[PDB]
Amino acid sequence: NNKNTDEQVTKALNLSHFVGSALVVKNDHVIYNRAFGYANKAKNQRNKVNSKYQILSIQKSMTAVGIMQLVQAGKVKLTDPISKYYPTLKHGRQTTLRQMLDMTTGFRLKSGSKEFLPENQVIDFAAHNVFYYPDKNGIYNYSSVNFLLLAGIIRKVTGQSYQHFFTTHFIDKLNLNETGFLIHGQGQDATTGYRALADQTLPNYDQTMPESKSQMANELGTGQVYMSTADLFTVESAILKGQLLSKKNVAILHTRTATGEYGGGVYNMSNGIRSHGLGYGYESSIFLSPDGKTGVVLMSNYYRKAAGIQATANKIFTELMK
């Protein structure tokens, strides 16, 4: 029952010290939709169901889909070497687009620019400053620069910005009204990130988390977007239902590797897909069934390592799936 569901999920969230918005869908029907704690404590603004949160690394699933759309259009191939798009790279030149999508490259960018740069200069800074580790080639190892460099390929091949691509193929395509780029401001129902102590569980809101324009620009392709929980579910479900990309091409994209569950910008699990993001005081979590009909989205503006939301979403999803 929805009464049962409401009591059980609210208890799980309360015991885990949840701050943010929670959405639970079963067989295409919303069965739980509630918010907890504060979007901004100093202004006495409560989080709401349609509050906007950082999707963080979950954005990489969307960058991946963009690449695979270009594959279907005949404009790139997953076998392409990175040097085809970045001809001044010194090392790792043989690395394929497939490996970039699967976090099986030896690339790592230690830091982005401290300056606020436009997209083309963010891309150039990465290509000039990335390190290459031959012993990490072909083995799962999480490295965000892979997806920033994928965002640069979208820009190069299309002749338009990544923001323009994202706006066209996600925001406009799916009529998203609670989604955008953090650099331009969140608008109504904005949230503020909070900084926690290592062992903190109870929220206290005594320290806000800054993010610079530089930090937001440097998350090109990788964690620069805000969404409501509804908008995030709409996107991920639309992917798996084959509304953005044929189901044949989703199947190609979303394939695990020999060394990891990660493939095509998501974790390919035993019972659907998972994506997790952390950064800037925020945490994001989605678990979704393979057919896109049943899942859980939690997003928080008050990340606490001692009260992580992914574990909570995992518990909810496991119960949901039986």
Author numbering: 72 to 393
What's the paper's own text on this?
We show that lipoteichoic acids (LTAs) but not wall teichoic acids are D-alanylated in Lactiplantibacillus plantarumNC8 cell envelope and demonstrate that DltE is a D-Ala carboxyesterase removing D-Ala from LTA. (a) The dltE gene encodes for a 397 residues protein composed of a transmembrane segment predicted between residues 12 and 34 and a larger C-terminal extracellular region from residues 34–397 and named DltEextra. The domain consists of two subdomains, an α-β sandwich (residues 76–126 and 246–397) that form a five strand (β1–β5) antiparallel β-sheet flanked by 5 α-helices (α2, α9–α12) and an α-helix-rich region (residues 127–245) folding in 6 α-helices (α3-α8). DltE is structurally homologous to the D-Ala-D-Ala carboxypeptidase R61 (DDCP) from Streptomyces that exhibits the classical β-lactamase fold of PBPs.
The first motif is strictly conserved in DltE (128SIQK131) and located as for DDCP at the beginning of the α-helix-rich region (α3 helix in DltE, α2 in DDCP) at the interface with the β-sheet. The positions of the active site S-X-X-K motif (128SIQK131), containing the catalytic Ser128 and Lys131 residues, and the catalytic Tyr213 from the second motif are conserved. The position of the catalytic Tyr213 from the second motif is also conserved and found in the loop connecting α5 and α6, close to the catalytic dyad. In contrast, several striking features distinguish DltE from DDCP and more generally from PBPs and DD-carboxypeptidases. The β3-strand that usually bears the third motif and defines one side of the catalytic cavity is not conserved in terms of length and position. The global architecture of the active site cavity of DltE is therefore reshaped and different from that of DDCP enzymes, adopting a deeper cleft topology largely opened on both sides of the protein. The catalytic Ser, colored in red, is buried at the bottom of the catalytic cavity in DDCP and lying in the middle of a large cleft in DltE.
